[PDB]
C-alpha cells in the first residue's frame, strides 16, 4: 500500500493506490482504500485490510451517533481520539495504520495513526509499504502555501512513486479533496496509468469442450 | 529521543528533539515531545510514542477533574499521577517521562520518572537514548539559579551534542518556558545548533 495526505490553502487532500495483495499475489487490482468516517472526514488505510475497514466503520458509526447527540458536525480530533484509544487498548493487535483528514467548524486537519495508538500531526504524511517512495517525493516538492490544484498534483505524484517503485503498491490512484466551506469530492480512479494491453488471442472455447457427467435444474423459489 | 528539563531563577524550561523512530527510518522529523497536562505543568516524553501519549492524555484528564473540584494542582501532584500510571502498569509500559511545572509558592520544579515508575525530584533532569552522551557535559555546566538566557543556551548546547552523537535523535530543538509571565514556546533549527 501507498497512502498520502497533503494540506493546502483552504483544506486538505488525501490519496491512495488501489492494489491489495495476499503475499506476492495481487488479490484485488482496484480496491478502495479511501474510507468515509463522516461526510467531510475521510480516512486512508494501510496494513491489515480487515482491521482498517472495521475500525473505520466502528468509529464512523459512533461519530454519526455523536453528531446526532450533540447536534454538531463531527470534528477530526474526535475521530482521532476515538481511533487511538481503541487501537491502544488492543496493543497493536488490530493492525490498522491510518491517515485521517477532513474539515470541521474548527478548520482543516491532517493526522496519522499507528497500530499501537500513537498519533502524529503534519502538513504532509505518508504510510504503507510505499511510504518511503512517496515521502521522497513529498520531501522534494512540498512547500508552504500550496493551492488546491498543486496539492492534488503533489499527492498523486507521491502515490505514483509508490506505484512504480514499490511492489506492494500498484494499479490506480484514488483521491479525495476536502475543502473548507465546500462538499468533499471523492475522485475514484483519478488516474489510471496501468491499463491492461490487448491480449494476443481470444481464449473463448468451442461449445462442448468441457466433458459433463450430469445436468439438473436448481430450485431457488419457495 | 533526547529530552531534558532545567529549573532556573524565574522558573523552569523543558527541552526536546523532534525525532520519532521506526527502526532506522525517521517516521516523523518534526515531532512535538513537549506536552501540556495543565496550564503551567508540562512533560517531556521518551520511549514508546503510543504509551507516552496514552499516559499524558489520562493525566491531563485527571488534572482537569482535579482542577474542577480542588483548584490548581501542584507539580508534585501531577508527578504523582504519572507515577501511579507508570508504576502500576510497569509490565506493559515503555515510558520515560520528565514532569516540569511552575507554582508561585514553589517556583520551578522538575520530577523525572524512569521505566520502573520511581519518582526523583531534581534541579534538572535528562532522559532518552541521547541523554547518555551528555551526562558529562550537563554535570560540568549546570549551575543553580541561572538566568533565562543562560538556561536556554545550556539546553541548546546540551541537546545539540545529544543530537550530534545519537542517531535516534535529531530534527529541530523544541523548548517550552514556564514562568510567572506565562508560557513561551521556542524552536531552534539545524543550521543554528549544529555549528555550535
Amino acid at each position: 500500500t501507498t497512502i498520502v495526505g497533503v494540506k493546502f490553502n483552504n483544506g486538505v487532500v488525501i490519496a491512495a493506490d488501489t492494489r491489495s495483495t495476499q503475499g506476492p499475489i495481487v488479490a484485488d487490482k482496484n480496491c478502495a482504500k479511501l474510507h468515509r468516517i463522516s461526510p467531510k472526514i475521510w480516512c486512508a488505510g494501510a496494513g491489515t485490510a480487515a482491521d482498517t475497514e472495521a475500525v473505520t466503520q466502528l468509529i464512523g458509526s459512533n461519530i454519526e451517533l455523536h453528531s446526532l447527540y450533540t447536534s454538531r458536525e463531527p470534528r477530526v480530533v474526535s475521530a482521532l481520539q476515538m481511533l487511538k484509544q481503541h487501537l491502544f487498548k488492543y496493543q497493536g493487535h488490530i493492525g490498522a495504520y491510518l491517515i485521517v483528514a477532513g474539515v470541521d467548524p474548527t478548520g482543516s486537519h491532517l493526522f496519522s495513526i499507528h497500530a499501537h495508538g500513537s498519533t502524529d500531526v503534519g502538513y504532509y504524511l505518508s504510510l504503507g509499504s510505499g511510504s518511503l517512495a512517496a515521502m521522497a517525493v513529498l520531501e522534494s516538492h512540498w512547500k508552504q502555501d500550496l493551492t488546491k490544484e498543486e496539492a492534488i498534483k503533489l499527492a498523486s505524484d507521491a502515490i505514483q512513486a509508490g506505484i512504480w517503485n514499490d511492489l506492494g503498491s500498484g494499479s490506480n490512484v484514488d483521491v479525495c479533496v476536502m475543502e473548507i466551506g465546500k462538499d468533499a469530492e471523492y475522485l475514484r480512479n483519478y488516474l489510471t496509468p496501468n491499463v491492461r494491453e490487448e491480449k494476443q488471442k481470444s481464449y473463448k472455447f468451442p461449445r462442448g469442450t468441457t466433458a459433463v457427467l450430469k445436468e439438473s435444474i436448481v430450485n431457488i423459489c419457495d | 529521543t533526547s529530552i531534558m528539563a532545567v529549573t532556573f531563577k524565574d522558573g523552569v524550561i523543558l527541552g526536546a528533539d523532534s525525532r520519532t523512530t521506526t527502526g532506522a527510518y525517521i517516521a516523523n522529523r518534526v515531532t512535538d515531545k513537549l506536552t501540556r497536562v495543565h496550564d503551567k505543568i508540562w512533560c517531556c516524553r521518551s520511549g514508546s510514542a503510543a504509551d507516552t501519549q496514552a499516559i499524558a492524555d489520562i493525566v491531563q484528564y485527571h488534572l482537569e477533574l482535579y482542577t474542577s473540584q480542588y483548584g490548581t494542582p501542584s507539580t508534585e501532584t501531577a508527578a504523582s499521577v504519572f507515577k501511579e500510571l507508570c508504576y502500576e502498569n510497569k509490565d506493559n509500559l515503555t515510558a520515560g517521562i520528565i514532569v516540569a511545572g511552575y507554582d508561585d509558592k514553589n517556583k520551578g520544579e522538575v520530577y523525572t520518572i524512569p521505566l520502573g515508575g520511581s519518582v526523583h525530584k531534581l534541579p534538572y533532569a535528562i532522559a532518552g537514548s541521547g541523554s547518555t552522551f551528555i551526562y558529562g557535559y550537563c554535570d560540568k555546566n549546570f549551575r543553580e539559579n541561572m538566568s533565562k538566557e543562560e538556561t536556554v543556551d545550556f539546553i541548546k548546547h546540551s541537546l545539540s551534542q545529544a543530537i550530534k552523537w545519537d542517531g535516534s535523535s535529531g530534527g529541530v530543538i523544541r523548548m517550552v518556558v514556564l514562568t510567572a509571565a506565562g508560557v513561551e514556546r521556542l524552536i531552534f533549527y539545524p543550521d543554528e545548533y549544529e555549528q555550535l
Binding site: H116, S118 | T22, S48, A49, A50, G128
Partner: peptide, 4 residues
C-alpha cells in the same frame, strides 16, 4: 513501533 514508533519510538522517541
Amino acid at each position: 513501533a514508533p519510538l522517541x
